[PDB]
Curated annotation (Swiss-Prot):
The modification ADP-ribosylarginine is found at R14, R24. Disulfide bonds join C2-C30, C4-C19, C9-C29. It comes from Homo sapiens (Human). The chain holds residues 65 to 94 of 94 of the full protein. The modification Phosphotyrosine is found at Y21. This is Neutrophil defensin 1. It comes from the Eukaryota.
Amino acid sequence: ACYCRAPACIAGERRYGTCIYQGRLWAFCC
């Protein structure tokens, strides 16, 4: 499952681009 996270994905997850959330650049993590 994928979630938008800060400041980076939690280890074990892989990043698939970024997500602008509340106007902030976060990581899209699955």
